[PDB]
mmCIF file of C-alpha atoms and ligand atoms in Angstrom:
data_model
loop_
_atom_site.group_PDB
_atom_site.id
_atom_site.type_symbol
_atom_site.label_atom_id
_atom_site.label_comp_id
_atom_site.label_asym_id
_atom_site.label_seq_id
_atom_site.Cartn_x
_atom_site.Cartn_y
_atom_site.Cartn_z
ATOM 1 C CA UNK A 1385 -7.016 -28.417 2.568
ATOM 2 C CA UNK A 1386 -9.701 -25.503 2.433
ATOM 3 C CA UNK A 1387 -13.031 -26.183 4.892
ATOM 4 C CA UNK A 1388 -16.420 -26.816 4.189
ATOM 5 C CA UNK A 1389 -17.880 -23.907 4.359
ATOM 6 C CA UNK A 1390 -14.436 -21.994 3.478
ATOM 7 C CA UNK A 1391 -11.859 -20.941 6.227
ATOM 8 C CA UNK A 1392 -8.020 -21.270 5.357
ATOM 9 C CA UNK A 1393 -6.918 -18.360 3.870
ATOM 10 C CA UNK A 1394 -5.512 -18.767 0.558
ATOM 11 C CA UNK A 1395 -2.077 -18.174 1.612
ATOM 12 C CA UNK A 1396 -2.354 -21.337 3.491
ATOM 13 C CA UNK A 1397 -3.314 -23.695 1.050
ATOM 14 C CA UNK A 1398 -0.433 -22.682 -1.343
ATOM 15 C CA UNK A 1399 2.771 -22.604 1.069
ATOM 16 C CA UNK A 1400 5.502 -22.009 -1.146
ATOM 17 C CA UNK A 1401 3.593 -18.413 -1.903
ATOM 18 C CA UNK A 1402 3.072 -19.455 -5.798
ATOM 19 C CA UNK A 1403 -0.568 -19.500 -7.045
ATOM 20 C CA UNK A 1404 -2.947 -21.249 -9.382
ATOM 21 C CA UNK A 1405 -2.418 -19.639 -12.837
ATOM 22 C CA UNK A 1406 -6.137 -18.241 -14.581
ATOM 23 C CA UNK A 1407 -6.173 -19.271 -17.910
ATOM 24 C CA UNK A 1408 -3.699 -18.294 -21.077
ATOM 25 C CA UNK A 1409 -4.650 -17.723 -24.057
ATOM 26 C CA UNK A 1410 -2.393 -16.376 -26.944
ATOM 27 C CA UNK A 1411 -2.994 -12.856 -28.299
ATOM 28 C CA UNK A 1412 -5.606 -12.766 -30.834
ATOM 29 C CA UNK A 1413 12.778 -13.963 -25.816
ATOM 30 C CA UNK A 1414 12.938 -10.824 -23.964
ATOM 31 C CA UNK A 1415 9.185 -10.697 -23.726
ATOM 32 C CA UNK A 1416 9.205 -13.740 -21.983
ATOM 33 C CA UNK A 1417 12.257 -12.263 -19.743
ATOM 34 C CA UNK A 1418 9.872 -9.096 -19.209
ATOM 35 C CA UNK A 1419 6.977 -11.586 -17.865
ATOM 36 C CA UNK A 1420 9.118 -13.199 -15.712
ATOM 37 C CA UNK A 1421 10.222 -9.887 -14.380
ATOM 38 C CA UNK A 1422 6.830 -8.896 -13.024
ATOM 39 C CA UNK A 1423 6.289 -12.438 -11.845
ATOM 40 C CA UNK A 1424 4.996 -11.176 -8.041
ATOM 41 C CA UNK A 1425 2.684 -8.653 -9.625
ATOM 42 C CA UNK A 1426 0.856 -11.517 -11.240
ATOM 43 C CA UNK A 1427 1.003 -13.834 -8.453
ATOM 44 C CA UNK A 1428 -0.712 -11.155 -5.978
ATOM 45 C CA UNK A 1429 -3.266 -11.200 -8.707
ATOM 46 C CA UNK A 1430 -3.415 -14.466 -9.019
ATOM 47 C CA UNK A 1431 -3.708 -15.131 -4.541
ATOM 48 C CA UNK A 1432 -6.518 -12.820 -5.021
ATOM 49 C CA UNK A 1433 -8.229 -14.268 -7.944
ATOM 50 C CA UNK A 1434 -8.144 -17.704 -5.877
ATOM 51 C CA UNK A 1435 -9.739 -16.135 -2.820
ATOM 52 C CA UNK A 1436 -12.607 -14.283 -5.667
ATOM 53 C CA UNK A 1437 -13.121 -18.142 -7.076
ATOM 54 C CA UNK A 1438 -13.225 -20.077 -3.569
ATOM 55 C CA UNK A 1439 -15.941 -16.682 -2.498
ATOM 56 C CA UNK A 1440 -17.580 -17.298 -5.055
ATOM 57 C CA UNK A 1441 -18.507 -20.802 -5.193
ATOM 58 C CA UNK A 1442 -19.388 -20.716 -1.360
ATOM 59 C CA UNK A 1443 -22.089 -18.009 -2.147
ATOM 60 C CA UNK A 1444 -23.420 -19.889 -4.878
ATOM 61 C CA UNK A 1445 -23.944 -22.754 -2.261
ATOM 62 C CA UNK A 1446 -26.077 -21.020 0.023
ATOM 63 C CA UNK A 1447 -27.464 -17.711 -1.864
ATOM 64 C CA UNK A 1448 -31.375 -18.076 -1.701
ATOM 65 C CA UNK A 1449 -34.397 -16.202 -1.886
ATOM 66 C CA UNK A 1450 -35.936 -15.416 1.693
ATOM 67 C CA UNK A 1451 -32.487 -13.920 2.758
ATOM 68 C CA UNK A 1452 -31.777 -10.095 3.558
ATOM 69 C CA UNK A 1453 -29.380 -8.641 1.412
ATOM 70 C CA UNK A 1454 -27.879 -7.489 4.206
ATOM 71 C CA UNK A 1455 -27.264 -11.025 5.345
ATOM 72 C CA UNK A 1456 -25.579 -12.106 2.098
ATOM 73 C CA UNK A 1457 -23.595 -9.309 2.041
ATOM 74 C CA UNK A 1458 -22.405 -9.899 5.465
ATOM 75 C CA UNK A 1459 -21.883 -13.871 4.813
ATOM 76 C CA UNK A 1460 -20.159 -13.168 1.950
ATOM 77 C CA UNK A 1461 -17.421 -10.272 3.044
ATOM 78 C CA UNK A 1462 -16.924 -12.550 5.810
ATOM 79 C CA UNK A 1463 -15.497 -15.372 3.824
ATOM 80 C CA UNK A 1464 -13.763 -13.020 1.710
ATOM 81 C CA UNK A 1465 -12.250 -11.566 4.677
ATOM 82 C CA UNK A 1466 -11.034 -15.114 6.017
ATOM 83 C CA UNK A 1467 -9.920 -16.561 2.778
ATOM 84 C CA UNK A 1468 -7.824 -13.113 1.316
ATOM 85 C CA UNK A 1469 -6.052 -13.152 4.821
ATOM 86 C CA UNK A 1470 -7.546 -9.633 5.565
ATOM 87 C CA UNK A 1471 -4.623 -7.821 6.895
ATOM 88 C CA UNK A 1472 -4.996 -3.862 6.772
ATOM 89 C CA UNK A 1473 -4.492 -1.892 3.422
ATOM 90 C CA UNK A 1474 -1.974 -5.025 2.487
ATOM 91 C CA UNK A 1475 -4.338 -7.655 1.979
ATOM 92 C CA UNK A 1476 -8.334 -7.226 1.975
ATOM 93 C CA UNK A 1477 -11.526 -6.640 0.204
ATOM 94 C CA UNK A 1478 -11.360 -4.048 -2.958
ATOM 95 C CA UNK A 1479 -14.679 -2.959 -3.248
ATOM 96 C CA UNK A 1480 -17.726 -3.317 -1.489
ATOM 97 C CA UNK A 1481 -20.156 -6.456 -2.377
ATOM 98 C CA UNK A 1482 -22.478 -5.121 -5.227
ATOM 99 C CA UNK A 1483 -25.626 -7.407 -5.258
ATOM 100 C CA UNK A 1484 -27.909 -4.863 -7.348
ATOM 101 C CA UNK A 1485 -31.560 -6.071 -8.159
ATOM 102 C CA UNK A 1486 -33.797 -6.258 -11.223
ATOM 103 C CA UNK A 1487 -33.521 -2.807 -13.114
ATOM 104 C CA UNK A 1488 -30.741 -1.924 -11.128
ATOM 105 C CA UNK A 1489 -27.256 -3.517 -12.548
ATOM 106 C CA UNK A 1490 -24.546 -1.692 -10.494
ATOM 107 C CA UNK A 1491 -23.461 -0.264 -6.998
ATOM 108 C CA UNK A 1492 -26.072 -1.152 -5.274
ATOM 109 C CA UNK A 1493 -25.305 -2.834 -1.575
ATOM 110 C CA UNK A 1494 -27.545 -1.837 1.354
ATOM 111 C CA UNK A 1495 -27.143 0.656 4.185
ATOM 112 C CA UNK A 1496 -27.865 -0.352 7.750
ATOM 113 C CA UNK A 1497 -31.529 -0.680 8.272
ATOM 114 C CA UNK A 1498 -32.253 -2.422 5.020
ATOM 115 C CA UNK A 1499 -34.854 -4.675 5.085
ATOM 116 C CA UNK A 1500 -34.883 -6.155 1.056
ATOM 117 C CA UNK A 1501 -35.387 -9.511 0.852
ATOM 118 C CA UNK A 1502 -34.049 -11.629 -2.085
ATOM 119 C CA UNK A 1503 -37.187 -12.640 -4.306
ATOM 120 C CA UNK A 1504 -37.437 -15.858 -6.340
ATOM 121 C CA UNK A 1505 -37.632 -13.466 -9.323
ATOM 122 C CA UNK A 1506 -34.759 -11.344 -8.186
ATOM 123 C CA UNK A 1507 -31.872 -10.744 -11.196
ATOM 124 C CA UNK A 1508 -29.197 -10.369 -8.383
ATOM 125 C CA UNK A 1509 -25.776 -8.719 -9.374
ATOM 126 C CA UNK A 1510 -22.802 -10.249 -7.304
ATOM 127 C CA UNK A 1511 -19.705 -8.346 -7.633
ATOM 128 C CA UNK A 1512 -16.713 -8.122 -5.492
ATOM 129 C CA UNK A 1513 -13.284 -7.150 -5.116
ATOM 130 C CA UNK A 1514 -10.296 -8.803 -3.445
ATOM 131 C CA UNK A 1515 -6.943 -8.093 -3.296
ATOM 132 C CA UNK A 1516 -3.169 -8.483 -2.260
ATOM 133 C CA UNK A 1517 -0.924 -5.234 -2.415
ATOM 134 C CA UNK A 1518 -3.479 -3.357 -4.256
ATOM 135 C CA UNK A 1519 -3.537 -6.121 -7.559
ATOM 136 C CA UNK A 1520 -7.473 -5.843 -7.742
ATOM 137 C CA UNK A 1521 -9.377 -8.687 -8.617
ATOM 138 C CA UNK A 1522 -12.693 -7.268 -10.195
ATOM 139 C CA UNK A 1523 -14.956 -10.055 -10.612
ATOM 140 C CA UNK A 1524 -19.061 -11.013 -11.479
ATOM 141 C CA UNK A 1525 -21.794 -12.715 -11.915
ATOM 142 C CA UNK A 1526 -25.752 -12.722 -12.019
ATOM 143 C CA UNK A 1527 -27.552 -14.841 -9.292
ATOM 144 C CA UNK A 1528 -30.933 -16.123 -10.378
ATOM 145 C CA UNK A 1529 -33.604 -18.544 -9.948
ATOM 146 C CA UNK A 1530 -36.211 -18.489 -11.875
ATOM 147 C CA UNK A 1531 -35.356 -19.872 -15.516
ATOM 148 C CA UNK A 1532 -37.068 -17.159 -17.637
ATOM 149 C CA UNK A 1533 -33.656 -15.213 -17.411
ATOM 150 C CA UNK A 1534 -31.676 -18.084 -18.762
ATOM 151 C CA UNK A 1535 -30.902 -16.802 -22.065
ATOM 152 C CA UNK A 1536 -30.321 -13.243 -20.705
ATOM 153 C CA UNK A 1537 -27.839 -14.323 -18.659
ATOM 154 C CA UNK A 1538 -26.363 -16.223 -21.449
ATOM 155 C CA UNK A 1539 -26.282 -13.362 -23.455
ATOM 156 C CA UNK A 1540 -24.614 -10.902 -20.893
ATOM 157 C CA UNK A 1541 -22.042 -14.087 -20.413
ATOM 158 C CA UNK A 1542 -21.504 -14.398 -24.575
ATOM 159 C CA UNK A 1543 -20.841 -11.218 -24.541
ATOM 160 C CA UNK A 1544 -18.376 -10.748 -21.853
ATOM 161 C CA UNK A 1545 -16.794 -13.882 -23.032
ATOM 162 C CA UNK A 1546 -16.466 -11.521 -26.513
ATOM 163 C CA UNK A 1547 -15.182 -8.821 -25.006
ATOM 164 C CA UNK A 1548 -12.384 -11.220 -23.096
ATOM 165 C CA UNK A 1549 -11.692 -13.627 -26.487
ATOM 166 C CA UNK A 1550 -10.965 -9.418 -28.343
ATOM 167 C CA UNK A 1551 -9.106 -8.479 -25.757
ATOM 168 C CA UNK A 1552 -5.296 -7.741 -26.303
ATOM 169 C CA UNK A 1553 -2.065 -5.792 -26.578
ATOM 170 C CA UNK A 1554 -2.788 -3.123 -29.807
ATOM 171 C CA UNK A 1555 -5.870 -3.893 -29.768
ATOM 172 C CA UNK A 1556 -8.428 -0.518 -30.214
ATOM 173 C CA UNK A 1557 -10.826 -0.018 -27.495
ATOM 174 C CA UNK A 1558 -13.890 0.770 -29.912
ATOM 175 C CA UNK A 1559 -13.705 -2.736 -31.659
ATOM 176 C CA UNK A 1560 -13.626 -4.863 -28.547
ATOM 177 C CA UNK A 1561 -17.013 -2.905 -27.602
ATOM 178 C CA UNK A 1562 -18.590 -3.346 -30.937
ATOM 179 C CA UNK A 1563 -17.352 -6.856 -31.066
ATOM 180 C CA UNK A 1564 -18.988 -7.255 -27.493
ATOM 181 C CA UNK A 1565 -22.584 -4.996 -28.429
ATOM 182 C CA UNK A 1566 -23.039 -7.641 -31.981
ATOM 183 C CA UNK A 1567 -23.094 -10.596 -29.816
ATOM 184 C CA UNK A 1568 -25.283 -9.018 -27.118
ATOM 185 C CA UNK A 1569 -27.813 -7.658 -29.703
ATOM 186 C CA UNK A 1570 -27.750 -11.992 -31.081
ATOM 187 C CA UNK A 1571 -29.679 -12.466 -28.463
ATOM 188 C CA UNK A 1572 -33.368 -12.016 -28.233
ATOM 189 C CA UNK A 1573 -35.331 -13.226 -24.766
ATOM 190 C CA UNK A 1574 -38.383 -14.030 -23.399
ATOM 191 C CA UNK A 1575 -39.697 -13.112 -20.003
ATOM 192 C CA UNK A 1576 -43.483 -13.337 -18.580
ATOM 193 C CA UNK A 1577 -44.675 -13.472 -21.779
ATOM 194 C CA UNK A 1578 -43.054 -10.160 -23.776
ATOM 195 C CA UNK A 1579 -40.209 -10.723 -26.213
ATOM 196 C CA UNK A 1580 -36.974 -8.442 -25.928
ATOM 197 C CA UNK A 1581 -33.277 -7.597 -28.307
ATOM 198 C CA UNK A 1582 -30.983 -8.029 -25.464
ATOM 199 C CA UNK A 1583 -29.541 -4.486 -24.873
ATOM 200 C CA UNK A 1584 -25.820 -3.530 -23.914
ATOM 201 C CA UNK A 1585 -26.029 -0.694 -21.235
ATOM 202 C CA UNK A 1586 -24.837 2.053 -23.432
ATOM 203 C CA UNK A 1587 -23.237 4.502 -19.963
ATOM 204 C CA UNK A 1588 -22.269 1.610 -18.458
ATOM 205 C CA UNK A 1589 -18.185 0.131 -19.234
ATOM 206 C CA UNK A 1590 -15.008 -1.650 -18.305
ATOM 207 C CA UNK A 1591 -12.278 -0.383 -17.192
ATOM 208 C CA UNK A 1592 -8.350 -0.611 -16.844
ATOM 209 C CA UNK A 1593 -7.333 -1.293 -13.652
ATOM 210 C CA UNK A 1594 -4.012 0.202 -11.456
ATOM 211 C CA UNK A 1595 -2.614 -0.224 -8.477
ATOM 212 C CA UNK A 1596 -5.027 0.803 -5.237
ATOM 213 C CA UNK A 1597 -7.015 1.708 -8.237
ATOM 214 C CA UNK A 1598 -10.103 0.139 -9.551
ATOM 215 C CA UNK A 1599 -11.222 2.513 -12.639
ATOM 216 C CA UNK A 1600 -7.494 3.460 -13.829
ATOM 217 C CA UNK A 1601 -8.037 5.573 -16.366
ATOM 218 C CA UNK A 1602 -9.246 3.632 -19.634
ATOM 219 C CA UNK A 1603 -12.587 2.337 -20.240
ATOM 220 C CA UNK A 1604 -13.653 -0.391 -22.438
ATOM 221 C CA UNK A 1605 -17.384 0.053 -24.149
ATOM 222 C CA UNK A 1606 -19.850 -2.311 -24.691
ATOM 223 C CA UNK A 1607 -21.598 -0.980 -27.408
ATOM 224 C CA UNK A 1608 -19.948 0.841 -31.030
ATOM 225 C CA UNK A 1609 -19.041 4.299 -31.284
ATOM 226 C CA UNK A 1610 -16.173 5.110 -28.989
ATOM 227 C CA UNK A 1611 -12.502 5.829 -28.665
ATOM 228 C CA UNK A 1612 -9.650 3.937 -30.830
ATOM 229 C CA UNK A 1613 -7.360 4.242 -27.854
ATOM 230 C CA UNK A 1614 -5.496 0.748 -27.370
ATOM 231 C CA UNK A 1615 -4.726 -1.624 -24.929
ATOM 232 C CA UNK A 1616 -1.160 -1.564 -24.538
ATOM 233 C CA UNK A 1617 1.427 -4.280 -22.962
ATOM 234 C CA UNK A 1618 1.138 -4.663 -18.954
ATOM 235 C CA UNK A 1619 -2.654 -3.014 -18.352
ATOM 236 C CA UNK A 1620 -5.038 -4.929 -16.310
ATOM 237 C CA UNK A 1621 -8.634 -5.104 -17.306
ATOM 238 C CA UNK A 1622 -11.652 -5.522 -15.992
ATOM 239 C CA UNK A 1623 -13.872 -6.736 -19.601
ATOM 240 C CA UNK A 1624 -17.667 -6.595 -18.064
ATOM 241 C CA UNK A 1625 -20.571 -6.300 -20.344
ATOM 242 C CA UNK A 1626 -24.305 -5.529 -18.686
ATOM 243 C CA UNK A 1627 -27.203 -6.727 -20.726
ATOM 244 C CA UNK A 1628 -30.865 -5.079 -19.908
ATOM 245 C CA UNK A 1629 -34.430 -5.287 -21.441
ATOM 246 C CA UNK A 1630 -35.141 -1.780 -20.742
ATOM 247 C CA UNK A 1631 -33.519 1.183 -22.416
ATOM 248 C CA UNK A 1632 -30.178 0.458 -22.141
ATOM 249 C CA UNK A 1633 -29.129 3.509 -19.849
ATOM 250 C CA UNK A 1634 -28.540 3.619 -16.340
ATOM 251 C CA UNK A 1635 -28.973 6.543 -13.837
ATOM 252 C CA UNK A 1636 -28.908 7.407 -10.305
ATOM 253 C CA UNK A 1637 -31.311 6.111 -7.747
ATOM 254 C CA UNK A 1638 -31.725 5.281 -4.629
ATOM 255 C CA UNK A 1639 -29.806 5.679 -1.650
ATOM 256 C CA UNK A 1640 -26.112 5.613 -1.928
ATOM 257 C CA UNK A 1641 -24.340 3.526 -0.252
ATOM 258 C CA UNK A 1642 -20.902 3.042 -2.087
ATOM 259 C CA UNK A 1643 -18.267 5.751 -1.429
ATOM 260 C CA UNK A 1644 -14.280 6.378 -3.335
ATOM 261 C CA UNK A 1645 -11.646 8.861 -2.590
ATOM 262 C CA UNK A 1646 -10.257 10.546 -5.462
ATOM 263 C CA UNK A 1647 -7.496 9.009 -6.531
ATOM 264 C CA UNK A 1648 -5.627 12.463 -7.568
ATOM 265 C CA UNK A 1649 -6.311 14.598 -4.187
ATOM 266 C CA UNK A 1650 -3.739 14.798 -1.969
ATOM 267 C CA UNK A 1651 -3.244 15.540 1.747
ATOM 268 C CA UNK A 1652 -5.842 18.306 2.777
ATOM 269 C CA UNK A 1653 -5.674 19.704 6.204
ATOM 270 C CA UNK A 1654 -8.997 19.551 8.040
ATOM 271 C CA UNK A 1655 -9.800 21.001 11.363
ATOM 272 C CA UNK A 1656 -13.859 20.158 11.496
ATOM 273 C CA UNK A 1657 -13.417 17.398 14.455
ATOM 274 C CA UNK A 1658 -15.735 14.667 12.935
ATOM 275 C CA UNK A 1659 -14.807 15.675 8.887
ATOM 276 C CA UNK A 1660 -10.935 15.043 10.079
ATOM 277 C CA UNK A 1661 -11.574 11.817 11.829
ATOM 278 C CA UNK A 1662 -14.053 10.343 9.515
ATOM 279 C CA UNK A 1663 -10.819 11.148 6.719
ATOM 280 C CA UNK A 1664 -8.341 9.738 8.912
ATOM 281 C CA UNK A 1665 -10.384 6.549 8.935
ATOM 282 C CA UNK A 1666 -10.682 6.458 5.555
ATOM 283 C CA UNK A 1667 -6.680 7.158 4.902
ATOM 284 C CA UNK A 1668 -6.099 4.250 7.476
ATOM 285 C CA UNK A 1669 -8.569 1.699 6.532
ATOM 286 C CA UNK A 1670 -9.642 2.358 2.730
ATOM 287 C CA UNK A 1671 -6.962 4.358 0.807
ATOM 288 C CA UNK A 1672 -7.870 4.940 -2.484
ATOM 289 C CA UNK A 1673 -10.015 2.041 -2.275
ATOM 290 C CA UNK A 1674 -14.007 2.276 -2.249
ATOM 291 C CA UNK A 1675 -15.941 1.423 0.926
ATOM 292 C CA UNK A 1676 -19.537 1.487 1.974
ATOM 293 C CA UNK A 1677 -21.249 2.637 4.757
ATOM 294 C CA UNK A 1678 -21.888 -0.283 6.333
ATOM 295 C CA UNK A 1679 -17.967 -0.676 6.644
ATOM 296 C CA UNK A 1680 -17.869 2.459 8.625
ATOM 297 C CA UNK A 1681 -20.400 1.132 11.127
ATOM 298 C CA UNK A 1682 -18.420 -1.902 11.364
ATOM 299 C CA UNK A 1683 -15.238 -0.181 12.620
ATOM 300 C CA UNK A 1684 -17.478 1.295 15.191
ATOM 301 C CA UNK A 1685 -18.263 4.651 13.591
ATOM 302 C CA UNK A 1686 -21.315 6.664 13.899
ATOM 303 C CA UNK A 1687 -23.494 9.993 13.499
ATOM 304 C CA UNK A 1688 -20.399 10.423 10.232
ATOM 305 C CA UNK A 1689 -23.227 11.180 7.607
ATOM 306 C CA UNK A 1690 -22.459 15.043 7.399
ATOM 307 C CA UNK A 1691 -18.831 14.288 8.148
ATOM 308 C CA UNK A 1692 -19.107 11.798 4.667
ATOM 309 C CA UNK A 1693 -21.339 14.565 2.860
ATOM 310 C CA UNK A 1694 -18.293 17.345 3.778
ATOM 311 C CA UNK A 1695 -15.774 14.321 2.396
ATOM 312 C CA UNK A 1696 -17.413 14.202 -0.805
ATOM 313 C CA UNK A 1697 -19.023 18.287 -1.086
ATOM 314 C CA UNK A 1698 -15.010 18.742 -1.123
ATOM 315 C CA UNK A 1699 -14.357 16.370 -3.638
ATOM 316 C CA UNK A 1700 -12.106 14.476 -1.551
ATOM 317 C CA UNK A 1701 -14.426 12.385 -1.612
ATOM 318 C CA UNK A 1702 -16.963 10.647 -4.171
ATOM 319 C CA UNK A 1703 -20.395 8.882 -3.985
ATOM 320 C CA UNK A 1704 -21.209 6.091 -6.482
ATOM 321 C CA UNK A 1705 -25.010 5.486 -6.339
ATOM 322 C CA UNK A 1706 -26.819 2.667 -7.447
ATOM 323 C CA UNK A 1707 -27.080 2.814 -11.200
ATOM 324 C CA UNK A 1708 -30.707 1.929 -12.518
ATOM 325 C CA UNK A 1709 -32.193 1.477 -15.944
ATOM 326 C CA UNK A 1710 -36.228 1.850 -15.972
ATOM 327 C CA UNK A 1711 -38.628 0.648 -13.673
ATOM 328 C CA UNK A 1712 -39.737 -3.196 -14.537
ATOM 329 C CA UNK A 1713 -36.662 -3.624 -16.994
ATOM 330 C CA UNK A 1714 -33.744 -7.081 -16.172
ATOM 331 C CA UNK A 1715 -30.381 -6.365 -16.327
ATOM 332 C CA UNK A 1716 -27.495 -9.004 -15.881
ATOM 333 C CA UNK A 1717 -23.603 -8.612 -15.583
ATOM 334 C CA UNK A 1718 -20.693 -10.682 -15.992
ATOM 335 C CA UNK A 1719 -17.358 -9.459 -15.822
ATOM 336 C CA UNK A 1720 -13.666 -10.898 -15.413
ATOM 337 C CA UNK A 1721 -10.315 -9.552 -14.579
ATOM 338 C CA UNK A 1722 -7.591 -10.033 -17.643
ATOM 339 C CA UNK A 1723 -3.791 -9.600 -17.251
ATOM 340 C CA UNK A 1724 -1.608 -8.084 -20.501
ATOM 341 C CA UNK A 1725 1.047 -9.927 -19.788
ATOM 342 C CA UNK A 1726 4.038 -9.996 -22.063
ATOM 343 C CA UNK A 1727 3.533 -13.490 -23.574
ATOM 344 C CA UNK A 1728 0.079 -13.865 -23.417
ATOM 345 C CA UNK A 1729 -3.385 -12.681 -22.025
ATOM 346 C CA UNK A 1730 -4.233 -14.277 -19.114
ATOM 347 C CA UNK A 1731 -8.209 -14.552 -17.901
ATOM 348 C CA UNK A 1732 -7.021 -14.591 -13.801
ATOM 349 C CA UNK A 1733 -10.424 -14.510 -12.792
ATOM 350 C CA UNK A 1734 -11.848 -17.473 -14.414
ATOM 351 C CA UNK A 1735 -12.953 -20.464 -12.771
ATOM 352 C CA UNK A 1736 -14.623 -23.275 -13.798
ATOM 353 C CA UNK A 1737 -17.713 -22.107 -13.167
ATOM 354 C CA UNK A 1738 -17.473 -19.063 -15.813
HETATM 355 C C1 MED B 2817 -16.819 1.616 -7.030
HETATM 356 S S1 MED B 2817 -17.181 0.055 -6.351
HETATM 357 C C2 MED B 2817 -17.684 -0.854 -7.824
HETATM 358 C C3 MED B 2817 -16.383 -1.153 -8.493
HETATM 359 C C4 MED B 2817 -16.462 -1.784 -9.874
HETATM 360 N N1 MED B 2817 -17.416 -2.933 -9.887
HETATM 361 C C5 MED B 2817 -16.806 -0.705 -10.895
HETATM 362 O O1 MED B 2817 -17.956 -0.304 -11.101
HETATM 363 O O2 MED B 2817 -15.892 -0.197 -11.535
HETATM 364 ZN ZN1 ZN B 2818 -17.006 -5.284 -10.767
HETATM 365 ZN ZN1 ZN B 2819 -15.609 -3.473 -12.927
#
């Protein structure tokens, strides 16, 4: 029995080492014999997605306006940590806790020294990453509490829900996007008084997922107009959909915080002290996995900001910055994790909460 506030690990809870299935649905024999044959690959998934849901619901509890985002970030990676059984590059946290505010929808988490302070009128973006053996659980949702975002964050949640129900094994990239931008665009809001068409953000996508490897190679639009590619039998998914009230672009801004090596580099011989031991900590703790900076401090590193900049000026390395639509505009995010699976799709993310 898991502890108020959460503290068995997942693992624990579920001794025989089989987890809580997310929910099947049937696509919109020897299949079934090719399901069963990748049966640990979805369980890992499936450990993971737990750990996301039991997260999740603990933040929800205690997420309020008045705390540092630092705080939340730290009170929720800690939980993650505990409940995912945190055990090197086998077991731990996928991604660093996103918890981008207002105008900003994406890869935004602070930097040590950062003083923000959740607002009541915040438009908070939780997203976070778990996972067993490198089977990613990539996994969101949109914090508020003042009601005028209601029916933006139902739109964002319609939509994703779209994007999840079109979802499935021949099915062409470009349609689940345009199936995901009509229901977004249903959607008209009002907030302090000016009326707004719910936007999709246009730059802004899911992705296929691999192994140690969050953005795998295809990308799944939220808006019409881009590739026919298909989904094909055994791909992972991440279906998110971000809705804004500004233009419906995101750039760069800010101070970055969020950090990736590239998947396709290989070994590269360093002999610049601080560049090769900042790398080596990466290799060790990260992978192919993305960290943030605050991570590095953690594990007791400092004075590594050049030694990062060198990391990425090589391309070994790459930054993610917060992504940003326009000053003053709301955007929201949901976003779930889908396995292909042979016999059916299954939503391994979802929870009854969404
Ligand atoms: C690179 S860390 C953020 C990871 C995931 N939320 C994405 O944007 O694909
Ligand atoms: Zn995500
Ligand atoms: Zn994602």
């Amino acid at each position: 029995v898991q502890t108020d506030p959460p503290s068995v690990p997942i693992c624990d809870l579920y001794p025989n080492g089989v987890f809580p299935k997310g929910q099947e649905c049937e696509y919109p024999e020897e299949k079934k014999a090719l399901d069963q044959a990748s049966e640990e690959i979805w369980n890992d998934f499936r450990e993971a997605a737990e750990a996301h849901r039991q997260v999740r619901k603990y933040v929800m509890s205690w997420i309020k306006p008045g705390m540092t985002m630092i705080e939340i970030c730290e009170k929720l990676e800690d939980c993650s940590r505990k409940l995912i059984k945190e055990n090197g590059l086998n077991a731990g946290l996928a991604f660093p806790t996103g918890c981008s505010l207002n105008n900003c929808a994406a890869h935004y988490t602070p930097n040590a020294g950062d003083t923000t302070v959740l607002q009541y009128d915040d438009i908070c973006k939780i997203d976070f990453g778990t996972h067993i053996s490198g089977r990613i659980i990539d996994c969101a949702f949109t914090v508020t509490f003042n009601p005028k975002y209601d029916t933006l964050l139902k739109a964002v949640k319609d939509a994703t829900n779209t994007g999840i129900k079109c979802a499935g094994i021949d099915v062409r990239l470009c349609d689940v996007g345009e199936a995901i931008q009509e229901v977004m665009e249903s959607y008209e809001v009002e907030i302090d008084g000016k009326t707004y068409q719910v936007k999709p953000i246009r730059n802004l996508n899911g992705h296929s997922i691999g192994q140690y490897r969050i953005h795998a190679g295809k990308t799944v639009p939220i808006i019409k107009g881009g590739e026919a590619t298909r989904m094909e039998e055994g791909e992972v998914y991440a279906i998110e959909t971000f809705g804004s009230t500004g233009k419906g672009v995101v750039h760069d801004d800010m101070e970055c915080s969020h950090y990736m090596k590239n998947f396709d580099v290989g070994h590269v011989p360093i002999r610049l002290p601080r560049t090769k031991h900042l790398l080596n900590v990466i290799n060790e703790n990260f992978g192919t996995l993305a960290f943030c900076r605050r991570w590095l401090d953690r594990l007791g590193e400092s004075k590594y900001l050049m030694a990062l900049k060198n990391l990425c000026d090589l391309g070994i390395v790459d930054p993610y910055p917060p992504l940003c639509d326009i000053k003053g505009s709301y955007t929201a995010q949901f976003e779930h994790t889908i396995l292909l699976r042979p016999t059916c799709k299954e939503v391994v993310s979802r929870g009854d909460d969404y």
